Design a protein around this ligand. Structure first.
Ligand SMILES: [Mg+2]
Ligand SMILES: [Mg+2]
Ligand SMILES: [Mg+2]
Ligand SMILES: [Mg+2]
Ligand SMILES: [Mg+2]
Ligand SMILES: [Mg+2]
Ligand SMILES: [Mg+2]
Ligand SMILES: [Mg+2]
Ligand SMILES: [Mg+2]
Ligand SMILES: [Mg+2]
Ligand SMILES: [Mg+2]
Ligand SMILES: [Mg+2]
Ligand SMILES: [Mg+2]
Ligand SMILES: [Mg+2]
Ligand SMILES: [Mg+2]
Ligand SMILES: [Mg+2]
Ligand SMILES: [Mg+2]
Ligand SMILES: [Mg+2]
Ligand SMILES: [Mg+2]
Ligand SMILES: [Mg+2]
Ligand SMILES: [Mg+2]
Ligand SMILES: [Mg+2]
Ligand SMILES: [Mg+2]
Ligand SMILES: [Mg+2]
Ligand SMILES: [Mg+2]
Ligand SMILES: [Mg+2]
Ligand SMILES: [Mg+2]
Ligand SMILES: [Mg+2]
Ligand SMILES: [Mg+2]
Ligand SMILES: [Mg+2]
Ligand SMILES: [Mg+2]
Ligand SMILES: [Mg+2]
Ligand SMILES: [Mg+2]
Ligand SMILES: [Mg+2]
Ligand SMILES: [Mg+2]
Ligand SMILES: [Mg+2]
Ligand SMILES: [Mg+2]
Ligand SMILES: [Mg+2]
Ligand SMILES: [Mg+2]
Ligand SMILES: [Mg+2]
Ligand SMILES: [Mg+2]
Ligand SMILES: [Mg+2]
Ligand SMILES: [Mg+2]
Ligand SMILES: [Mg+2]
Ligand SMILES: [Mg+2]
Ligand SMILES: [Mg+2]
Lengths: 61, 200, 87, 128
RNA sequence: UUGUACACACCGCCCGUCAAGUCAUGAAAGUUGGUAACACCCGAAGCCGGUGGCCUAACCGUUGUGGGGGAGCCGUCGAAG
RNA sequence: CAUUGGAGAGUUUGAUCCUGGCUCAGGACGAACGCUGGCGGCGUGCUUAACACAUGCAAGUCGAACGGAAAGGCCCUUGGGGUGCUCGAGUGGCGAACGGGUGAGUAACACGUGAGUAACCUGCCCUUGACUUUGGGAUAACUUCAGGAAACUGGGGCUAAUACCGGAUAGGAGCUCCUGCUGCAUGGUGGGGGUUGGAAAGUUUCGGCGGUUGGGGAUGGACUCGCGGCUUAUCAGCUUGUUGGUGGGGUAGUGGCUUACCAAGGCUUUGACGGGUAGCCGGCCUGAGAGGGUGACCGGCCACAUUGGGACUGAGAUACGGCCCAGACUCCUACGGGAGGCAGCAGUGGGGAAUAUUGCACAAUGGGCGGAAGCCUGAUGCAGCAACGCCGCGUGCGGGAUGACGGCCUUCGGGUUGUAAACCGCUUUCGCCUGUGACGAAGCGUGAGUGACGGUAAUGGGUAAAGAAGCACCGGCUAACUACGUGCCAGCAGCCGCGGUGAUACGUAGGGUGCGAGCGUUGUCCGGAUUUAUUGGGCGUAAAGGGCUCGUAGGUGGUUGAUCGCGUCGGAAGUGUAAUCUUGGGGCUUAACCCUGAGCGUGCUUUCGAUACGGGUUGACUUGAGGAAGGUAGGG
C-alpha cells in the first residue's frame, strides 16, 4: 500500500523497515495509511517543539 | 494529581472568586493572559463548562473523581445537583474548611493529607474521605498546636459555620449534625448547568 | 510411559486383560455349546448345557469380568431358548 | 464422596470462606450442591455462621467434613449433636460492639471539657 | 410574461470518441495451487466371528487324559496408502 | 391514580426548504504506538503459529495386605539380628478419568432453558439386613544361565500374600406359576409356590483397620425430548441401513446400535442437501429503551491433547504427563534396532503492532493415598515483571505589590506572564534514613513446636519545600490568540477546508485551554444514525408500486347463540447455582475492591381459576360476496 510520511523532514529510503498506521490523506487518492514517525527505521522530525509525540520527537532539555 | 499552580489565574478565568477576598482579584472582569479584555461569545458548552470548572477548582477535585461524584449523584434519588453538592461538601477537607479550622480548602487538604486529624477515633489522611452523619472529626493530639490551627482559633469567630456542623474550636472537634442540604451549601455555582453538561 | 505408577499400571492392565479374555472366551464357548445343543434339538443335552452356561455367566459376573446385567441378559436368552425347545 | 468444605472468596490477603457442600472431584471454587454457612477468619473472634438444620441433614446423609469444617462444627456445637463427643462446644464469642448515635449525643452535650480542654489548648498555644 | 441543467451568470454550462498517464476490475490459449468427497485395489492395529494338528500349573479323571484356556491361522469391518 | 429516561454539529445553493449520504463531539477495550513517567491498593497480561520445543518440575501413596533387607537407625568382633522403628527395588490395594490447559474441530440435542428414563449405570461415603465357610495351584522380587551397543528379552531353580483359582452356603439374578392393588402402551408393585444358580480376607504397635452380599440414601454420569440463539437460493433436490416392520444378536441402557427377512419409505421452497463462518452460556461493552456488538479474567457445559484410527484396564476413559498401529517430525544407535510429544508451570526459538519469572511455600483453602504421625500437590496461596485497566495519594500550605527583573506584545503610554517570583512563616502524606512490628492459625502437631508472603502491612522518630509534571490542543463544530518565519513552497486536516505576502488553520515563540501520571494517535465495537424505523421511516415529482390480471401456499375476517379454555389474563408450587448487575447493611484509613441481606434472574414446567377478545368445534342471521329473473349501455 501507499503510506504518507508526515512532518517536515524525511530519512527513510529503499528497504527501510517502517511501522504503518491507519489514517487518510484527503487530497491524495489511494493513500489510506501513514508512517509512524519515531518507530523502527523512520525517525522523528528534527525541529519539532510542539505536538512532538505525534511526530516521534524526544523532549529536548 | 493535584493542582499546585496559581489559583487567582483560575478565579479570573472563571470570573468568580474561587476562594478568599481582597486580593489580586481587583483584576477580576477579565481572564488571565494577553487576551483578557476582549468581548466573549460564551456558547452553552462554554457556560456549562465554566460552571463545572468553577466547582472543580473550588473544591480541589480533578476530572475523574468529579465524574465519579456525578454518576453517584445521578444514581442517587433526588435532585442530581443537590446530591452532587452534598457529596462535595461531605468531603473531609471541605468539612474542615467549613468548620473553620483551615484558612482555605488547600490548607485543609494539606493538614488532612498530613494526618493532623482523627475521624471518630481513627486517623484519616485522605482528603476525599466522605464524612458520614453523626461523625466526630478530631484534631490529632500531637498536632493540636499547629500554627494554622492557632490562626483558625484566633479567626473563627468572624467565620460562619454552617448549620449542619457544630465546632468546639479550642477543642478541635467537628460534630456532624446531618449531611447538608442545598439550602445549606452556599450558592456559588450552577449545579443544574453541571448536570446538563454531563449529559452531552 | 514416564511415570513408574503408569508402568506398573500397564503391567497390571496386561495381566487383567489376559484374565478377562480367558473368562470371556470360556463364557462364549459355553453359550455356543448350548446353542448347538438347541439347534440339534436335544432336550437333555440342551438342559445340561444351559445349566452350565448360566452358572458360568453368574460366576463371571461375580468375578467382575462381565456386568451383572449382561449376565442376566444372556441367562434370560438361554432360558427362553431352552423353554422354547422344551415346548 | 460428598464433602462439606470451605470455598475461598474475597481479596488477596483477605479470605472469606463459604461452608459449602460439594463432591470431592469438583474444583475448590466451583459449583456447589448447597451453601451452608460462612467463615470469616480474618475478622476478630472469627465469624462462624453454620446452618444447623442443613449441616445436620448432610452429616446424617453421609457428607464427609474437611478438618476445617470439623473445627467449625465443633465451635458451633453441630459436631457434638452429630457424632456425640465430649467437646467444649465454644459457641463463637461476639466480635464486640461499637456505636455512633450514643457517642454523638454524649459529645454534643460533652461540651464542658470539650471547649474546656479547648481553652486549655488555648493556654497551650500560650505555652506553644 | 414564458422556458432553463446558467448563477464565474450564454464569452455560461455541458456530451462522447481519440491521444497520454495512473488505479481497480472482466475476458482469455493456458498455467499453477488448494479443499471437500466419491468409485475401485490393497489393507496395519484392534474388537468381533471362526478355526487351532501346536502350547497349556488351578478343573475333572476310567490318574493312559478330558474340560477350559493360549500362541498361531482365516474372515468381516478397518486408518493410511 | 406519573416518570427516572432520549441534546446535536458541519457539509449540495447566489440564496432557500426538503430529501440524503458523508464527517465529528460520547462511551468502551485482554489493545498497540508516540511523548512522558512519582507512589500505593486491587485486578489483568500470546487475541497471531492447535507453530516446532532444550532444561527442571507438574501423581503419587500405603510396612496396620506380602516376601523381604539395597540404604539410614538400634543391639552385637568386620558382619550379624529382620531383631524394633525405619526402608530402595518387587508383588498387592487405591489414586492415576480429579485438579490444570487449550478452543482446533463442531451449525450439532454441542449449548441455554424446562422436562422424561415404566430404557439406565454409579468406586470411595452414609444407612440397614444377612454373612465372613472349605481347599488348592502358581508367580514377581531373589537366584542362575543365555542373548542385546542399548532398550531390554528368553530359559532353569526358588518364594509370600487382602495376588490367583476348585467347592459349600446366601436374595430382590434366570425361567415359570398363582394371587392383591394398580400405571402412561411397552407395564409398575405387594404376597406365596416351583425350578436353576451367583460371594468373601485377612491384619494390628491390641488402641485398630478391613472382607463379601441384598435393600435404600447421597454423589456423579448416560440417553431421550419440547422450546431457543448465525449466514448463504448466483446451493433444489437429499437419503438405500436410508424410513418403518418382524426375529436374532449386542449393550449399563432404549434404539438400524447391529444383523437377517419383508415393505418403500424418510427429509425439503415454512429452505432439506451443499457452501461460508463459529466452541455455547452465565456474562461484557454500548444504548432512554427496544436492540446492536461480543464470549478475555471468573463460573457452568462441550470438544480436543503431535495427525489419523483403535481398543485395553477400570465404578468411571477425547485416557494431557497410558498402551497398540500408521503418517509426519526430533533424538540415540555398535545400523541389528530403540526413545519422544509443554494447547501442565516457568522458559526458548519462531510469527507478530503486541502480552511476564527457567521465583517462594505447602503456612492457609482444595485434592490423592495412609489407621495415624505423615508423604505428594507449578491445584492454590504468594512474590517478580509491565501505567495494561480501575481506584486513591503526592509533587507543597498561608502571607507577600514594590505589581521587581527577564521573556512576549505594544498604539512605546503600557499590557501580560503574575502573588507568579523574590522574600517571610509554616506542615511532613509519599519518597529516602532508622525503630517497633502484626492478623491471616478457634488451623496443624502426642508433644516440642508450627506463616511461604515477611522485617511485609501498619506504626514511632529523622531529613529537607525538598527527591517528584507532563501531554494534547487554541479557524468552525470545540474549551482556549497573538507575534515572528515561510510564500499553493514547506506543510496541515476528522469534515468544511488552510498555504498564491498582514496565515488566530503550516513552523517556532509568548500567552492560553482541556486533562494530568498520564496525554495523544491508530485499530475495533456501540452511540449519535428514526441511516433496516417492532418500539420508530417510507414509495405522484427526492431512492422506492411489480406492465396487467388470474390464482397456490400463507396472512387476514360481517352480526350473533352455545361450548372448549390453545393464544390471552390472574394466583400457587418448582426452577432460573455462584459470581456479575440493582439496592440495603458491614469491612479494608477513603475509594477501587471485598463480605453479607434482598431484588433481578425479563423465561420455562406443573397446577388451580377467569372467558372480554383471538382461535378451535358447533348452530343461526343477511347487510359483504355470489347466483336467478327482468331491464340495459358500449371502437370489449
Ligand atoms: Mg476357542
Ligand atoms: Mg436380549
Ligand atoms: Mg450552479
Ligand atoms: Mg479472471
Ligand atoms: Mg480390505
Ligand atoms: Mg479371537
Ligand atoms: Mg481344547
Ligand atoms: Mg486380521
Ligand atoms: Mg482412506
Ligand atoms: Mg444541486
Ligand atoms: Mg457552499
Ligand atoms: Mg519401599
Ligand atoms: Mg477442565
Ligand atoms: Mg472459552
Ligand atoms: Mg481377591
Ligand atoms: Mg435447534
Ligand atoms: Mg429388533
Ligand atoms: Mg474455530
Ligand atoms: Mg453470540
Ligand atoms: Mg473458562
Ligand atoms: Mg471394563
Ligand atoms: Mg493419564
Ligand atoms: Mg484430565
Ligand atoms: Mg505434556
Ligand atoms: Mg507454557
Ligand atoms: Mg517478531
Ligand atoms: Mg490439607
Ligand atoms: Mg493429619
Ligand atoms: Mg513431587
Ligand atoms: Mg471558542
Ligand atoms: Mg506571516
Ligand atoms: Mg439504530
Ligand atoms: Mg458510526
Ligand atoms: Mg427516510
Ligand atoms: Mg401505499
Ligand atoms: Mg424517482
Ligand atoms: Mg401500475
Ligand atoms: Mg416482469
Ligand atoms: Mg386461501
Ligand atoms: Mg370475527
Ligand atoms: Mg360468545
Ligand atoms: Mg452479591
Ligand atoms: Mg466503610
Ligand atoms: Mg444468580
Ligand atoms: Mg371461533
Ligand atoms: Mg341477464
Amino acid at each position: 500500500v501507499t503510506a504518507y510520511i508526515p512532518g517536515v523532514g524525511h530519512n527513510l529510503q529503499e528497504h527501510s523497515m517502517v511501522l504503518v498506521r491507519g489514517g487518510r490523506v484527503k487530497d491524495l487518492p489511494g493513500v489510506r495509511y501513514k508512517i509512524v514517525r519515531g518507530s523502527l527505521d523512520t525517525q522523528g522530525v528534527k525541529g519539532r517543539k510542539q505536538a512532538r509525540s505525534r511526530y516521534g520527537a524526544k523532549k529536548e532539555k | 494529581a493535584r493542582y499546585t499552580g496559581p489559583l487567582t489565574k483560575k478565579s479570573r478565568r472563571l470570573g468568580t472568586d474561587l476562594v478568599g477576598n481582597d486580593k489580586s482579584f481587583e483584576r477580576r472582569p477579565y481572564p488571565p493572559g494577553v487576551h483578557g479584555r476582549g468581548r466573549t461569545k460564551d456558547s452553552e458548552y462554554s457556560l456549562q463548562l465554566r460552571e463545572k470548572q468553577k466547582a472543580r477548582y473550588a473544591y480541589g477535585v480533578l476530572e475523574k473523581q468529579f465524574r465519579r461524584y456525578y454518576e453517584e449523584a445521578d444514581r442517587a434519588q433526588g435532585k442530581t445537583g443537590d446530591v452532587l453538592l452534598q457529596i462535595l461538601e461531605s468531603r473531609l477537607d471541605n468539612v474542615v474548611y467549613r468548620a473553620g479550622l483551615a484558612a482555605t480548602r488547600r490548607q485543609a487538604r494539606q493538614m488532612v493529607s498530613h494526618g493532623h486529624f482523627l475521624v471518630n477515633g481513627k486517623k484519616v489522611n485522605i482528603p476525599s474521605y466522605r464524612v458520614s452523619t453523626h461523625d466526630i472529626i478530631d484534631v490529632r493530639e500531637k498536632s493540636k498546636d499547629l500554627p494554622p490551627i492557632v490562626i483558625a482559633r484566633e479567626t473563627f469567630e468572624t467565620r460562619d459555620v454552617p448549620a449542619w456542623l457544630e465546632v468546639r474550636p479550642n477543642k478541635g472537634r467537628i460534630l456532624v449534625h446531618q449531611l447538608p442540604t442545598r439550602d445549606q451549601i452556599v450558592i456559588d455555582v450552577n449545579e443544574q448547568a453541571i448536570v446538563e453538561l454531563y449529559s452531552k | 510411559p514416564n511415570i513408574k505408577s503408569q508402568i506398573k499400571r500397564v503391567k497390571t492392565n496386561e495381566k487383567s486383560r489376559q484374565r478377562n479374555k480367558a473368562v470371556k472366551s470360556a463364557l462364549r464357548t459355553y453359550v455356543r455349546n448350548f446353542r448347538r445343543a438347541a439347534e440339534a434339538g436335544d432336550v437333555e443335552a440342551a438342559t445340561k448345557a444351559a445349566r452350565v452356561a448360566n452358572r458360568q455367566l453368574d460366576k463371571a459376573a461375580s468375578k467382575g469380568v462381565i456386568h451383572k446385567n449382561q449376565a442376566a441378559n444372556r441367562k434370560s436368552a438361554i432360558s427362553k431358548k431352552l423353554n422354547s425347545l422344551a415346548a | 464422596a460428598t464433602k462439606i468444605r470451605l470455598k475461598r472468596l474475597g481479596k488477596i490477603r483477605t479470605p472469606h470462606y463459604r461452608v459449602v457442600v460439594m463432591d470431592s472431584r469438583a474444583k475448590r471454587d466451583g459449583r456447589a450442591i448447597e451453601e451452608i454457612g460462612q467463615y470469616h477468619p480474618k475478622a476478630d473472634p472469627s465469624v462462624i455462621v453454620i446452618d444447623s438444620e442443613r449441616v445436620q441433614y448432610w452429616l446424617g446423609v453421609g457428607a464427609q467434613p474437611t478438618e476445617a469444617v470439623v473445627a467449625l462444627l465443633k465451635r458451633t456445637g453441630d459436631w457434638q449433636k452429630f457424632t456425640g463427643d465430649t467437646s467444649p462446644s465454644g459457641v463463637k464469642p461476639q466480635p464486640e460492639r461499637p456505636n455512633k448515635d450514643d457517642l454523638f449525643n454524649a459529645a454534643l452535650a460533652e461540651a464542658d471539657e470539650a471547649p474546656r480542654e479547648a481553652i486549655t489548648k488555648k493556654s497551650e498555644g500560650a505555652a506553644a
